Enzyme design. Structure first.
Site, short mmCIF file in Angstrom:
data_model
loop_
_atom_site.label_atom_id
_atom_site.label_comp_id
_atom_site.label_asym_id
_atom_site.label_seq_id
_atom_site.Cartn_x
_atom_site.Cartn_y
_atom_site.Cartn_z
N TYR A 296 10.01 6.70 2.97
CA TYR A 296 10.91 8.03 3.31
C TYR A 296 10.16 9.12 2.40
CZ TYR A 296 13.31 5.45 -0.70
OH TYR A 296 13.78 5.20 -2.44
N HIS B 298 5.74 0.06 -12.27
CA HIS B 298 6.93 -0.71 -11.79
C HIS B 298 6.69 -2.00 -12.50
CE1 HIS B 298 7.08 2.80 -8.74
NE2 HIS B 298 7.62 3.44 -9.87
N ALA B 299 7.52 -2.15 -13.49
CA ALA B 299 7.39 -2.87 -14.52
C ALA B 299 7.11 -4.70 -13.72
CB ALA B 299 8.65 -2.69 -15.69
N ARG B 300 8.93 -4.34 -12.58
CA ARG B 300 9.67 -5.56 -12.32
C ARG B 300 8.59 -5.68 -11.21
NH1 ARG B 300 14.76 -2.76 -9.17
NH2 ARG B 300 13.16 -1.48 -8.04
N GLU B 301 7.50 -5.21 -10.81
CA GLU B 301 6.29 -5.94 -9.66
C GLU B 301 5.28 -6.47 -10.12
OE1 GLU B 301 6.99 -1.78 -7.22
OE2 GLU B 301 5.75 -1.72 -7.98
N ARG C 101 11.84 -1.22 -13.88
CA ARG C 101 11.32 -0.86 -13.15
C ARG C 101 10.60 0.80 -14.01
NH1 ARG C 101 12.62 4.29 -8.84
NH2 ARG C 101 11.13 2.28 -8.04
N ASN D 46 6.05 6.71 -11.00
CA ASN D 46 5.92 7.02 -9.40
C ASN D 46 6.93 8.40 -9.07
OD1 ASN D 46 3.38 6.97 -8.07
ND2 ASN D 46 4.53 6.37 -6.37
N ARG D 47 6.94 8.71 -9.39
CA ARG D 47 8.46 10.33 -8.82
C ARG D 47 8.15 11.21 -10.46
NH1 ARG D 47 10.59 6.84 -5.54
NH2 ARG D 47 12.25 7.50 -4.47
N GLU E 42 1.25 -1.71 -1.15
CA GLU E 42 2.84 -2.89 -1.24
C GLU E 42 2.33 -3.91 -1.31
OE1 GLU E 42 5.38 -1.95 -2.35
OE2 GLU E 42 5.74 0.23 -2.63
N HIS F 87 1.45 -1.66 -5.44
CA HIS F 87 2.93 -1.61 -6.26
C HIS F 87 3.33 -2.97 -4.96
CE1 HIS F 87 3.62 2.23 -7.50
NE2 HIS F 87 3.02 1.82 -7.43
N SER F 88 4.53 -3.23 -5.56
CA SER F 88 4.98 -4.42 -4.84
C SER F 88 6.66 -3.99 -4.01
CB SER F 88 4.93 -5.62 -4.53
OG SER F 88 6.06 -6.08 -5.91
N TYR F 89 7.29 -4.77 -3.46
CA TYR F 89 6.85 -5.19 -2.09
C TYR F 89 7.05 -4.46 -0.83
CZ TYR F 89 12.12 -6.20 -1.44
OH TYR F 89 13.18 -5.83 -1.36
ZN LIG Z 1 6.18 0.04 -6.63
#
Ligand SMILES: [Zn+2]
Length: 304
Positions: free
Chosen positions: A244, A64-67, A122, A139-140, A266, A192-194
C-alpha cells in the site's frame, strides 16, 4: 553465546561483529557509521576480498525492532560468505568482484527494547518534543515523498514519520553513508518481515520506476529461485500496489539517488507466527533467502 540458529541480543550481536571480523580479516572489515539515539554503535561490515575501486551492494537488516528474522538473516549471510569463499564458485566470484556492505542492525535501540520491555516495539527510541510518546518509524523517515502519504505526523503513532526527513540519528547515518558511496553502490537491499514479498519502487506513489519491467523480471526470477529450496511462495511488485502507499521508505529513497536495483524483502511467514517467527524456522528462512540474494547479486554483477 552467539548462535546462527537463535535470535541474539544486541550485546551478543555486537561481540559477534568483533569476533567474525577478527577471525576473517581477509574477507571482513568492521566500521561504525554513527551512534544511535541511545549511544549504541551502528556497525557496518564490509564483506569481500579487499581490492582497489570495487563496486558494491548495500544490504541492511533490523530497520524495525520486532522483525527478529531480519537481524538473523544478516548474520547468516556473513557466515555463508566467509565459509564458502574459495569453494562455491558464485560466492567466490562475488566476493572477488564486489563488496557487500552489510549493516546487521540499524535500529539497535528498538531491538534492545524488544528484548527488555516490549517484543512488539518497531520504532526507534528517541524522545519527541511536547509528549511522553517515544520513537519514529525509521522506514518512514527518508526523503522520499516524506510524510506525504501512508504515514502519521503524530509521535504517539506506530507510523510516525518523524519531525523531519532524517531526523533520526540512525537514518541520517545510513543516508550519509550511502550518499558518500554512491559511485560504488550498485544495488540496495533492505531486509524486513513478514509477508513473503520482494518489493521494488515506488511505495510513496503509484508511479513506476523507469526500469519497472527489468525490476519485475528480476523480482520474479528471485522469487522463483527462492522457492526451489523448500517451496516457500513469495509475491512481488511495486510497493504501492503490492502492499500500500507509504512515504519515506529507504528503498524509494535509494532508488531516487540513482541506485537502479533497490528491493525490500519481507521474509517469512504469512501471519501464522508473524513477527514472532520460531527459532526453528531461522535456518530454512535464511537458506532460501540466500538463494534470492545471490540470484540478484549474480544479475547485478553481470549487468555492470
Ligand atoms: Zn519492517
Amino acid at each position: 553465546g552467539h548462535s546462527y540458529e537463535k535470535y541474539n541480543n544486541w550485546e551478543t550481536i555486537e561481540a559477534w561483529t568483533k569476533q567474525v571480523t577478527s577471525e576473517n580479516p581477509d574477507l571482513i572489515s568492521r566500521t561504525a557509521i554513527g551512534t544511535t539515539f541511545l549511544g549504541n554503535n551502528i556497525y557496518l561490515l564490509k564483506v569481500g576480498k579487499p581490492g582497489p575501486n570495487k563496486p558494491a551492494i548495500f544490504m541492511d537488516c533490523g530497520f524495525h525492532a520486532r522483525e527478529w528474522i531480519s537481524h538473523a538473516f544478516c548474520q547468516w549471510f556473513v557466515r555463508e560468505a566467509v565459509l564458502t569463499y574459495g569453494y562455491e564458485s558464485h560466492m567466490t566470484e562475488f566476493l572477488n568482484k564486489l563488496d557487500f556492505y552489510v549493516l546487521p542492525v540499524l535500529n539497535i535501540d528498538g531491538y534492545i527494547y524488544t528484548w527488555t520491555k516490549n517484543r512488539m516495539w518497531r520504532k526507534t527510541r528517541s524522545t519527541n518534543a511536547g509528549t511522553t510518546c517515544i520513537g519514529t518509524d525509521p522506514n518512514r523517515n527518508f526523503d522520499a515523498g516524506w510524510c506525504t502519504t501512508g504515514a502519521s505526523t503524530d509521535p504517539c503513532d506506530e507510523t510516525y514519520c518523524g519531525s523531519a526527513a532524517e531526523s533520526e540519528k540512525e537514518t541520517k547515518a545510513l543516508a550519509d553513508f550511502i550518499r558518500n558511496n554512491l559511485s560504488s553502490i550498485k544495488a540496495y537491499l533492505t531486509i524486513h518481515s513478514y509477508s513473503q514479498m520482494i518489493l521494488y519502487p515506488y511505495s510513496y506513489d503509484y508511479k513506476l520506476p523507469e526500469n519497472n519491467a527489468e525490476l519485475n523480471n528480476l523480482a520474479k526470477a528471485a522469487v522463483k529461485e527462492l522457492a526451489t529450496l523448500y517451496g516457500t511462495k513469495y509475491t512481488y511488485g511495486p510497493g504501492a500496489t503490492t502492499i500500500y502507499p507509504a512515504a519515506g521508505g529507504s528503498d524509494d529513497w535509494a532508488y531516487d539517488q540513482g541506485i537502479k536495483y533497490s528491493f525490500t524483502f519481507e521474509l517469512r511467514d504469512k501471519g501464522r507466527y508473524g513477527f514472532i517467527l520460531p527459532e526453528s524456522q531461522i535456518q530454512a528462512t535464511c537458506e532460501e533467502t540466500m538463494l534470492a540474494i545471490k540470484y540478484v547479486t549474480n544479475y547485478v554483477l553481470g549487468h555492470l
